[PDB]
Amino acid sequence: LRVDEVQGKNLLTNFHGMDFTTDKLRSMVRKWQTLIEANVTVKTSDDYVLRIFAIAFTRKQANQVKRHSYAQSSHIRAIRKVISEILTKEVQGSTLAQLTSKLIPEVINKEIENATKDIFPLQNIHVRKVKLLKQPKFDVGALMALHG
Amino acid sequence: SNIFKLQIDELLEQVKLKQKHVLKVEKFLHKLYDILQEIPDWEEKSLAEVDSFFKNKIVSVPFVDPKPIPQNTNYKFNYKKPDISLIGSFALKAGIYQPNGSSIDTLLTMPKELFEKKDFLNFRCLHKRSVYLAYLTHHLLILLKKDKLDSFLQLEYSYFDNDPLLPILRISCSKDYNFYKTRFSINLLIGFPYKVFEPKKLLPNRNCIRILPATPLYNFSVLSSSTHENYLKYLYKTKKQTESFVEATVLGRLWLQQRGFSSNMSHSGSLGGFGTFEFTILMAALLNGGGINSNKILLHGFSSYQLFKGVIKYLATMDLCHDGHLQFHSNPASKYIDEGFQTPTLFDKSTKVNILTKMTVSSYQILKEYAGETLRMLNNVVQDQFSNIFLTNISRFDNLKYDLCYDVQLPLGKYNNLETSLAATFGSMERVKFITLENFLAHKITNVARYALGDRIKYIQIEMVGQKSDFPITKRKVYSNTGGNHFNFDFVRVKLIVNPSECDKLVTKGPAHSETMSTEAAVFKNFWGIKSSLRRFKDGSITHCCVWSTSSSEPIISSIVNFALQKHVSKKAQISNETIKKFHNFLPLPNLPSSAKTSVLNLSSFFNLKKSFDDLYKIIFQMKLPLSVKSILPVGSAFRYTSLCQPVPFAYSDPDFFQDVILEFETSPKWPDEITSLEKAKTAFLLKIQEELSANSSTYRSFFSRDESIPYNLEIVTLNILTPEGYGFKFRVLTERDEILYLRAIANARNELKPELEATFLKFTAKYLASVRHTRTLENISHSYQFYSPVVRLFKRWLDTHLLLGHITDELAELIAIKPFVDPAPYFIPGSLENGFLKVLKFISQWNWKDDPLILDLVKPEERLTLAQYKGIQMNFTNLRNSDPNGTHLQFFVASKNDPSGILYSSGIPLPIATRLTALAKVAVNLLQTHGLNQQTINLLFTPGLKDYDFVVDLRTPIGLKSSCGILSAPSNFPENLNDLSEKMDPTYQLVKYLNLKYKNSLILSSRKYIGVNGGEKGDKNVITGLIKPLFKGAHKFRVNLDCNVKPVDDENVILNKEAIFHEIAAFGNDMVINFETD
Amino acid sequence: IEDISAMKNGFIVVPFKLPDHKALPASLHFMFAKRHQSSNSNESDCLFLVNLPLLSNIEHMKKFVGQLCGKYDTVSHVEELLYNDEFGLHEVDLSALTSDLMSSPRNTALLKFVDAASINNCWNALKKYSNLHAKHPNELFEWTYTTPSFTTFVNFYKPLDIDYLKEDIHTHMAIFEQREAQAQEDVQSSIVDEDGFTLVVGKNTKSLNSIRKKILNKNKKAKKDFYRFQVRERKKQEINQ
Q1: Measured between CB atoms, does C172 come within 8 Å of chain B?
Q2: Environment class of residue B569 by beta-carbon count within 10 Å: exposed (0-12), middle (13-18) or buried (19+)?
Q3: At which of C97, C114, C131 does a domain end?
Q4: Which residues of C179-216 are buried (b: 16+ CB within 10 A; e: fewer)?
Q5: Contact criterion met (CB below 8 Å) for B781 and B788
Q6: I want to staple B836 with a disulfide (CB 3.0 to 4.6 A). Which of B147, B571, B791, C178 is the partner?
Q7: Count of H helices and E strands in chain C?
Q8: φ and ψ at B576, to 5 degrees?
Q9: How far is CA B429 from CA B207, B417, B440, B699, C82, in A?
């Protein structure tokens, strides 16, 4: 959270980023699977620009006997393409208020999984990182309307 | 860079009539200079004789205050006759065919010896000017008496550029030798020699005159009268140099007159201070220089557009008044000094005069921004706007150029009452600083208001209105006992373009507090007095301030002007601004705790509704469902700050009580393929939400409507959750299998129903798919355009009062009302509720459908519609106006980046209602340009109906609805069973829509939907009108395709059964309707 | 003018009065009647009724013919109303336009009969009534507005009853899922044409209508060299230009 306005011994903060803790993705990576990762440079409905990341791990199905479940790298290109398309569509159609409200209940993840489950299974899709790059202007009234 | 040159050429072709109306007035000036050549001389005499000389003649001699007495005037006059010439605009051949009547200059210069080389004392220079012009006026009157041109010409004393110390004589051609077609007034000033002085006492800071306060108007006016041909000579040198100066002159002076900087004056409380000549000589200054390293920026060869661009860019970006200016030497380059002169400033070393001192600080500060705005609308390569650059006229109107204007009524009486009325200082040093009460009062009132507002306003303008720039032959100056004074006004109008963020900030703080008081804290306390106090804030800050009280009807900037006018200007003056009270009282005041003290920029009722929605939003996400909810997002007008009554808790009959919110579930591949079973699945999800919410969150109440607004699917059952905060929400379900299902209906429809179902899909896209980005952009744009939500609430009350808001869509109203903000050209961004509403009306009148669309981009000032997108929406506009070039079914084309098709929000409304809209637009601006702004003007401007609307059908309702609709003049419950909202709400809107849906071919109906915003102070008065189609004007034979009410009298013809149609109207609405009238 | 009740090509004026309004101080509504006999199931022997009034449900029409049978002893089997599009809602059928299953003149109405004697007796009784109202407008049997609109159409603000639309949604989705699995199985069987041909059907297509609509919606390599004549004509092109 980045402090932007300050009044009444308070600090009035706006969404500046989102990360994972390193032990989360280290608790996700296991060998004999492929990690697909995507990142787009998108602009929201404001003049904020975001670099938003995504990671997604290939899954072996139930009744799969062979141990690997690797991706065939054409499937990696197709999955990274559908992921980049769906999160550059989920931004540009959100504000930072609507996008923070979007990535609170992890719902872009279910969008990605439902878009991807006719290429590869792909367990635990995450977004892992949202980076602010450049911000438009101040707009104190919008900040105060975001707070209340 | 293709149509601007044709704009230049067509502008010159429309302003050039310079072959027939120039020769006759040329030869009339030829006869006039022969007249003054055969005028005779007048030998050396004095004032002691010349007072009784002019005693019992007909022509009086002008003067300035006080009348020069034979004590201090031992002064004598000489009458030497000079050479005549053509000066200024006519000297450089750029006269303009304004029908209001332009000018021409006459050279009556003087010899070096008739007037001594001691012109630096007590204005006897202009006194001998006055006596020379007086006897030349007298003998020109005798010479016209002998040459029989008495009847059609009238020689009148008038003001040379409104200057109270240089009066002149103008011919008015009042009603083979007659003159009644071209321009009227012909000026007569005198001139001086070029060298009558000493160099070291011509700067605007000197003084030698009586009791060392300096005198800018004296040492400027004497040097302006000195220089009337050196200017002409070096302007002829630069005219022989560049071949673009005549076209540059006509262009820039047309710019200046259409934005109001005509060469009147600014010092005397007048909009102006700058003109054609000043523009051309600073253009020549920029031509010869502009750079610190002697950098030339203006090349003496190129075109008119780039010359206009370079000089407007330079005088827009580079400062001249507050810090720095540039000088040039005419007899040649220019330099920049960083030394501000606290006046609009540019200097010579050849004429040694400060030119722009007819302009004041405020008029320069508004000139710089006018140039900057026209620069900023020259540097957009997307649109073409040369109407908005040159052809439009913003200074023809009074309250569109400025957001606020107050009538300072000054009944301050006579000069013996000046001391005991005016609370300021008048005396000797100020009478040598400023000339009169007019220009002193202008400087003092603008300085007092500028200090008392400061950061709450952008720019200030001051108007001594009623200013008479002419006075007849039988008087020496202006005799005017005009409404409580003896001076050249009747009241003042102070005008403000304001900072809308800082209007209703109820603290205008001063500097910080210390042990020893500052000069700034000192002048703060000498200013405010009983308001000046010491306050600590929540952030730990001891500061001096003055805390006001906010009010809805009275913006607190008005109370600041009232306070600092009734204390530091007069003690008995009045301030009048009641149009603002009229507009702010037309906005419905909400039934909220202490809602009369709340300002009009307070959106906290919407914010409280959004907080209740946040609670319900978290409850719906935390409940568990057969699908994960993708996103639940609101789309309501209350969520984009548009709702008419700002929503009170528990207002059943408020039509925008039930707000609309679109929830979508995750992209399931198990949605059905057929539309009615799809909608039964969507409402199955809504029933599951209902059952879980009533089971767990027991304080929430919910029931089901049945929506019919999207046609041909009569089962979109949105549930209506009534929250414990007194709010209601309409929950829709967007699935990804909806748009492709409707596009499928387009694909396999029969070929006579393809525009039918395409209109149905346009309604679906307008409701579900495009309204979401519509409310997103308007919610993000309302925070950068502050007054936009109250001007839309006024505009929608206006539409509902004129009973067209039943048909025209709210989103359409929001886009036509967002036009004066997101592209305001060439007006500024609206800083008033009144200015916003009047500029909405001016745009909807001035804008034409059949040629020009409404392509506008909803963004913040300083993502943009590019040239590609703009030419694309231009292309589909031209395609729509080739498939139908007269607007039969598509009347408005309002289009944005959010929806480039245009037809979305403006489809479906009839051409009768659209013609009524553009007619009421032109009617409103016509009455505003005829009458002017008064309480009765605004009263009729909101007075409904009473025009060629054919029906009047007056209705009631068994209970008033305004305690239960939140416009106050209390319900804080919900009924035990939810079938009582049905009797509480009003039915007239959907009953009229059902009637128009069944009578779509014979007559349109119209009504009002917000019932008691227009229906009296009780809230029951609804009206219905009808308009019969142009097809059903007479008596036609019955067919298969009549679709009307039949009543044949013969066997051939059939007529309407009008009596049966309104009998069944009353049998439909029998408890509600009370009366019927046939216009 | 009153005395005329029969238009040029098969039309009958049917007038009747209207009740009291407080703000109407001769209010009379018309019907245009015309018999027609077609060969269809519901298009046989119907009276085209133009300008049947606002919200014309079954109850006052049944009352109309009941008082007709109470006045002139006329037998009539009329318990139905067909093509009753009052407002203009059901001009298109969007379910049949979007999908195959659960499926398969403006300001007129159908008043359909059963028998030749029935339509004959009611027809000359209504022609006799048109002629006797053209002779005297006073003592026709008149309409009692036992208002159907105040109950049957006052639902614009009423809450929908929960168990009722619960059961409607339930039974509708039951029969839809039943015929949807039927429409899938009927394509995922073996469809062998009578001569020899088995129809290619996709893996998860679930209907035939979507297949034939996909047909309706979906209604070379190179060379510039390599041959004797092609290199010959290219040499001729370099000689030419």
Answers
A1: yes
A2: buried
A3: C114
A4: ebeebeeebeeeeeeeeeeeeebeeeebbeebbeeeee
A5: yes
A6: B791
A7: 7, 4
A8: -120, 120
A9: 11, 20, 12, 76, 98
User: Tokens in use for B998?
Assistant: 């069944």
Q: Looking at the 3D structure of chain C, how many domains does it have?
A: 2
CB B1079 within 8 A of CB B952: yes
How many CA atoms are closer than 13 Å to the CA of B191, on its beta-carbon side? Answer: 23
To the nearest whole Å, the CA of A142 is away from the closest chain B CA by 6
Tokens of B361: 């600080």
Q: Among all chains, which residue has been given the structure tokens 């009847």?
A: B151
> How far apart, in whole angstroms, are the C-alpha atoms of residue B966 and residue B651?
6
User: Which residue type sits at C55?
Assistant: L
DSSP string, B820-880: HHHS-TTS----SHHHHHHHHHHHHHH--TTT--EE-----------HHHHHHHHHHHHHH
Q: How long, in residues, is chain C?
A: 241
Method of determination used here: cryo-EM
B residues 692-751 near C, CB within 8 Å? Answer: 703-706, 711-714, 717, 741, 744-745, 747-749
CB contact under 8 A, A8 and B539: yes
* Structural domain contains residue C224: no
Do B936 and B831 fall into the same domain? yes
Q: Which of A9, A137, A141 is nearest residue B538 as measured by Cβ atoms? A: A9
| Domain containing residue C5 | 1-114
Residue listed under structure tokens 């210069």: B109
Contacts of C6 in chain B (CB under 8 A): 1051
Half-sphere exposure of B590 (CA within 13 A, CB side): 23
Nearest C-alpha neighbor of B1035 from the set B1021, B1024, B1019, B1051: B1051
**CA distances (Å), C42 to each of C59, C60, C82, in order?**
21, 22, 8
| Distance in angstroms (rounded) separating the CA atoms of residues B494 and B442 | 10
CB burial string C122-140: b at 16+ within 10 A, e below:
beebbeebbeebbeeeeeb
Place of tokens 């787009």: A40
* CATH number of the domain to which C121 belongs: 6.10.250.2760
Amino acid at residue number B1003 = L
Q: CB–CB of B1057/C12 below 8 Å?
A: no
B784 vs A45, A93, A139: nearest CB: A139
Resolution in A: 3.4
Distance from CA of C70 to the nearest CA of B (A): 26
Minimum Cα–Cα distance from C161: chain B residue: B704
**Looking at residue B388, what DSSP letter applies?**
I
My answer on whether B956 and B897 are in the same domain is no
Contacts of A47 in chain B (CB under 8 A): 863
